[PDB]
Design a protein around this ligand. Structure first.
Ligand code: FAD
Ligand code: HEM
Ligand code: JZR
Ligand code: SF4
Ligand code: F3S
Ligand code: FES
Lengths: 139, 614, 242, 102
């Protein structure tokens, strides 16, 4: 007989040198909110990280210190609308990623796994994300 | 003739063909006993029809009440309507407890009793005290998914031995030489290659052939492939006319609705609210034998009391039963009812109708699992050939199988086959040679179908066969109708020379595979309807309205005292042995005696024919 | 009879025997009035009546064997239990299980999946196996209950071929199918290798490539929840002691 | 350690739970103590997290080795720069507040 490790090895060996095509996946698969909120959780985490990394870089590379840049912006006396829009856009990712992260921590405790509760937790997440952002962008 | 197809030769001590419950058990049983074993199957093991078995597997464990395997032995012998070899039945039922305990120790997730033991339910025709002490409860089970669990447990167990599997390989024919089996030849579906597996012993556990019918509970894959390879080897098949119609295949889809439903308290009801079984089997009622319940339901329908818009089916009622019981004991059918009938078994009855389900007949073996031929009145075992599972005829089921006795059968004889080869042979013994062109005719036939460009497409032929068997060989049968069927059938078989296939490749050509299965299927259907036509008597599942009585060597309804025992040739208590001239499609019959002795009269008394009523 | 309802199906096609062939979608029209209610009924009707070269797996026809798993209308399911969409205005797209080497048409090469299953030793293991076969092991109703929702798996592979994690790391990530089964043996009150079964998953892939996407649970034809089993494993994975 | 993979998974969750708590702590007790905790917590979380990403989408012994290498640089640099900001500038909390004054 063949051990499992042996089988896996010949599987790859056989197929990678075959003329067999890979069946499609991401291009043909049906989305769901859960699936979409899941990858969005990834895109936001990454973006928060690239954001936090651009901040530290600037702290080490820009001639001026923070207060000066803040002033610079206040000296453009920008439309509150724009002000609010930017703040919102700033805190959304974080808000989405935070609430949804709490969702993941709940799942890690092993709760909320019925598919219908996954849909619930997610929607709650979406509304809490929208509310907290609005609240904050208004502060 | 030219080798347009490359050939790969393999040499093993043993070749098991089929990987359902029987094949798997046979295969690692062999490996376990030291034999370098190959298991050849057209399906990945867990896809086997066995995985669909529901109600259970019988064994006198006595977890529900006190039991006696001998009582189980009797129920089976009586169940078979005396066409069952009692040595086999003796073996099968005495081994049951051990065989089931073995499945549990393998991890089979059996349902449990309050005492942490295997929960067993009642099933059709099982009694305590040789038919005198009431309903037996020996159907061990996994809710209503015992086949699925049994097959997964066995496959998982097989993963522990050095058995070499050849999955999705289609066995074509046996490699016969001088009446001895040298192996099998097959088509590797994944890559279009031909393979010859030479072994000293070959076990055939290829399943039944319910797809000879238009409506069956069987899988599209139950095409009697091995039964067919026997035929083509010139060997006889036995009792093929003994087809079991399960009382409750769901109306429309055909999916089986376990007898376990009736075992748990379910009842059959006509278009007039009547629990008619209280009228056809006053004692056993809904728990009568399957042949009985199926006939009874049938009369009710043709007599006009059938339900539904076409009054063509009856109702299986379960809603009177507590919902937690349905959920715990019948979760499987509950869902199947909804999916294929839109029925919520907690509120409404399930529409059901007798459906071709199992094959009692098969390749004839002895109780050791060895295939036997019958020449000049004597049983001779074909060296190097064994068979087990539904593909065989040990026969522990004779003219009618007691529900839950197949899953038993599968593991007992599949192990028997292993134990036997073991006591008979030694691992490594020099594998028998095969002539350089052995199998060349299978390739021929294979290549011939691959390019067939006639006027009748496979699906067309097949359906012709299924519809013919369906209306000429059902619950009730008659000589004129059977005679018609035999001819239509022989026409269809002759017409196979007018076959047209379209797929011309060889890799995963299921156009071709299913045509090979049609050849296979037809070989079985022919033997089935011809054997039926010749059997002028009513026994178990075979009910001739033109020969309504069972005909034994004595009329056992009266004292044998001073009775002229009927000659072999003048009564029907004997096994049918069919043969077929592949070329013409001419069916040839012979008969062999039914084995009545047990393995030890002191331990289990042979049970004489008698009136059979429930 | 007379008065059809023609439904279109776009099904994936690829012949490994047509030299230099490219996957293509073929469209079939079927009359739902002369066809069973299930997509498999449609697939069979097509092979039988229009293109016997359309290849695919099937056997049981009642959703217990797991053979017919494929992607129908973007989701993994069993053709034999998935109702045909009656909306004649839509062409149902049928593909093979996602991200799989296609052997032919709708037939995926499942050997890696099978090997992964073999690798978790899905079978009862007791320390003392000296007493195998003498008596039924004892298991309470309560412990046998923990098996519900786990043993029913039919190893169809819909859940694993629906999980993006398995799409990217299928070579090392076991997948929901196999993991739930690994859990199926971890909690069988009769098995004595729970700690060893967890030990085998102490690596970055086998188990930890699950980031709780829950496609698996959504796609399961048997209504099983592999995603939850996976989370129970993580809790054990992080509490067991050597 | 034989339990490395599960120890990490736990630590990962423990850190998110940590980082979660610093959100309220930064708004109720802004100052050095929290500013550094955020530096540490944000760096670690973002690091482990970006590693899961690489692990999922980077294949081949080398590409992986590489991606991981450069992540380790991105992270030490990030933690460094965040610590610079906290030491030589207003620090994370006060900064946010100022940004949220525009
Ligand atoms: C249809 C059915 C039958 C059934 C049942 C429920 C349904 C829906 N429930 C049962 C129950 O609860 N209790 C019981 O005792 N019996 C029940 N049955 C009947 C019983 O399941 C069958 O008799 C039994 O499963 C037989 O199984 P067996 O081991 O004999 O084989 P199989 O499952 O049919 O599988 C056949 C194997 O052979 C291989 N094969 C077939 N043809 C070929 C070729 N040509 N080449 C290579 N291999 C071949 C198959 O691949 C398979 O592994
Ligand atoms: C600001 C933050 C940054 C820069 C950040 C960054 C990241 C990144 C890059 C990931 C990896 C994404 C992935 O693995 O798919 C991650 C994962 C995660 N973060 Fe955050 N995040 C922040 C705050 C938080 C907070 C407050 C919580 C709570 C949180 C909870 C999580 C969780 C639970 C995950 C793991 C999700 C999974 O299992 O896939 N994050 N974060
Ligand atoms: C990137 C594509 C965005 C799709 C987001 C939402 O997608 C929807 O989610 C619902 C809830 O799960 C599903 O029932 C529905 O079928 C699905 O289309
Ligand atoms: S878990 Fe569900 S889907 Fe996944 S394999 Fe088992 S059954 Fe098929
Ligand atoms: S979808 Fe995949 S990521 Fe985990 S929960 Fe299901 S296995
Ligand atoms: S054919 Fe068995 S699951 Fe569909």
């Amino acid at each position: 007989a063949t051990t499992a490790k042996e089988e896996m090895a010949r599987f790859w060996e056989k197929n990678t040198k075959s003329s067999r095509p890979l069946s499609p996946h991401i291009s043909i698969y049906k989305w769901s909110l859960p699936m979409a909120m899941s990858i969005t959780h990834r895109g936001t985490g990454v973006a928060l990280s690239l954001g936090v990394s651009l901040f530290s870089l600037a702290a080490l590379l820009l001639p001026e210190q923070f207060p000066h840049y803040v002033a610079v912006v206040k000296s453009l006396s920008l439309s509150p609308a724009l002000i609010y829009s930017a703040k919102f856009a700033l805190v959304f990712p974080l808000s989405y990623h935070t609430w949804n992260g709490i969702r993941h921590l709940v799942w890690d405790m092993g709760k909320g796994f019925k598919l219908s509760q996954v849909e619930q937790s997610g929607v709650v997440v979406l509304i809490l994300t929208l509310l907290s952002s609005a609240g904050i962008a208004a502060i | 003739i030219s080798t347009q197809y490359p050939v790969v030769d393999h040499e093993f001590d043993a070749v098991v063909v089929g990987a359902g419950g029987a094949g798997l058990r046979a295969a690692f049983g062999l490996s376990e006993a030291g034999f370098n074993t190959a298991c050849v199957t057209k399906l990945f093991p867990t896809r086997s029809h066995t995985v669909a078995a529901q109600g259970g597997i019988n064994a006198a464990l006595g977890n529900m009440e006190d039991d006696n395997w001998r009582w189980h032995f009797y129920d089976t012998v009586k169940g078979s309507d005396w066409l069952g070899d009692q040595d086999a039945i003796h073996y099968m039922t005495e081994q049951a407890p051990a065989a089931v305990i073995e499945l549990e120790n393998y991890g089979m997730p059996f349902s449990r009793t309050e005492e942490g033991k295997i929960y067993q339910r009642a099933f059709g025709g099982q009694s305590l005290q040789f038919g005198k002490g009431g309903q037996a409860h020996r159907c061990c089970c996994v809710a209503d998914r015992t086949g699925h669990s049994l097959l997964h447990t066995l496959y998982g167990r097989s993963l522990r031995y050095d058995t070499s599997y050849f999955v999705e390989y289609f066995a074509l024919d046996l490699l016969m030489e001088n009446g001895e089996c040298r192996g099998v030849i097959a088509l590797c579906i994944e890559d279009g290659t031909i393979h010859r597996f030479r072994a000293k012993n070959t076990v055939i556990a290829t399943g039944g052939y319910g797809r000879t019918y238009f409506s069956c509970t069987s899988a599209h894959t139950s095409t009697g492939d091995g039964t067919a390879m026997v035929t083509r080897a010139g060997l006889p098949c036995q009792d093929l006319e003994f087809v079991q119609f399960h009382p409750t295949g769901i109306y429309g889809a055909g999916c089986l609705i376990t007898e376990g439903c009736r075992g748990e308290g379910g009842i059959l009801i006509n278009s007039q609210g009547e629990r008619f079984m209280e009228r056809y089997a006053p004692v056993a009622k809904d728990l009568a034998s399957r042949d009985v319940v199926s006939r009874s339901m049938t009369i009710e329908i043709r007599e006009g009391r059938g339900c539904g818009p076409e009054k063509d089916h009856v109702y299986l009622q379960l809603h009177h039963l507590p919902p937690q019981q349905l959920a715990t004991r019948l979760p499987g059918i509950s869902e199947t009812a909804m999916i294929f009938a839109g029925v919520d078994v907690t509120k409404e009855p399930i529409p059901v109708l007798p459906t071709v389900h199992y094959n009692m007949g098969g390749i004839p073996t002895n109780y050791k699992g060895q295939v036997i031929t019958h020449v000049n009145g004597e049983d001779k075992v074909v060296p190097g050939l064994y068979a087990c599972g539904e593909a065989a005829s040990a026969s522990v089921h004779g003219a009618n199988r007691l529900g839950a006795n197949s899953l038993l059968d599968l593991v007992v004889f599949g192990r028997a086959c292993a134990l036997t080869i073991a006591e008979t042979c030694k691992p490594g013994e020099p594998v028998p040679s095969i002539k350089p062109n052995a199998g060349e005719e299978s390739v021929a036939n294979l290549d011939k179908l691959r390019f067939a460009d006639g006027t009748i497409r496979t699906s067309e032929a097949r359906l012709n066969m299924q519809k013919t068997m369906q209306s000429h060989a059902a619950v009730f049968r008659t000589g004129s109708i059977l005679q018609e069927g035999c001819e239509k059938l022989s026409q269809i078989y002759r017409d196979l020379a007018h076959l047209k296939t379209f797929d011309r490749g060889i890799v995963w050509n299921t156009d071709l595979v299913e045509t090979l299965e049609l050849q296979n299927l037809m070989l079985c259907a022919l033997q089935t309807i011809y054997g039926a036509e010749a059997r002028k008597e009513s026994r178990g599942a075979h009910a001739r309205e033109d020969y309504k009585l069972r005909i034994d060597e004595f009329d056992y309804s009266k004292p044998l005292q001073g009775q002229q025992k009927r000659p072999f040739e003048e009564h029907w208590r004997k096994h049918t042995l069919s043969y077929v001239d592949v070329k013409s499609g001419k069916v040839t019959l012979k008969y062999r005696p039914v084995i009545d002795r047990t393995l030890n009269e002191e331990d289990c008394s042979s049970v004489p024919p008698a009136i059979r009523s429930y | 009879a007379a008065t059809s309802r023609i439904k279109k199906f776009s099904i994936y096609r690829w012949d490994p025997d047509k030299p230099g062939d490219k996957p293509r979608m073929q469209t079939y029209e079927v009359d739902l009035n002369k066809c069973g209610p299930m997509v498999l009924d449609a697939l069979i009707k097509i092979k039988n009546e229009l293109d016997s070269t359309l290849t695919f797996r099937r056997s049981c026809r009642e959703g217990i064997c797991g053979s017919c798993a494929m992607n129908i209308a973007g989701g993994n399911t069993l053709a034999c239990t998935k109702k045909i969409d009656p909306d004649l205005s839509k062409t149902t797209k049928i593909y093979p299980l996602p991200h799989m080497y296609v052997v032919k048409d709708l037939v995926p090469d499942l050997s890696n999946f099978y090997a992964q299953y073999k690798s978790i030793e899905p079978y009862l293991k007791k320390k003392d196996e000296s007493k195998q076969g003498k008596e039924q092991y004892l298991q309470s109703i309560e412990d046998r209950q923990k098996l519900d929702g786990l043993y029913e798996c039919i190893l169809c592979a819909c859940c694993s071929t629906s999980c993006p994690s398995y799409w990217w790391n299928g070579d090392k990530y076991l997948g929901p199918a196999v993991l739930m089964q690994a859990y199926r043996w971890m909690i069988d009150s009769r098995d004595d290798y729970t700690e060893e079964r967890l030990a085998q998953l102490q690596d970055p892939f086998s188990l930890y490539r699950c980031h709780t996407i829950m496609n698996c649970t959504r796609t399961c034809p048997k209504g099983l929840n592999p995603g939850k089993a996976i989370a129970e494993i993580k809790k054990m994975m992080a509490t067991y002691k050597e | 350690s034989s339990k490395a993979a599960s120890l990490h998974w736990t630590s990962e969750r423990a850190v998110s739970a940590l980082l979660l708590g610093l959100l309220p702590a930064a708004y109720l007790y802004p100052g050095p103590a929290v500013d550094y905790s955020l530096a540490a917590a944000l760096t670690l979380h973002g690091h482990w997290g970006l590693g899961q990403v690489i692990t999922d989408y980077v294949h081949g012994d080398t590409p992986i080795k590489v991606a991981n290498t450069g992540l380790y640089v991105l992270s030490a640099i990030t933690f460094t720069g965040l610590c610079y900001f906290n030491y030589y500038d207003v620090g994370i909390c006060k900064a946010v507040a100022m940004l949220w004054s525009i």
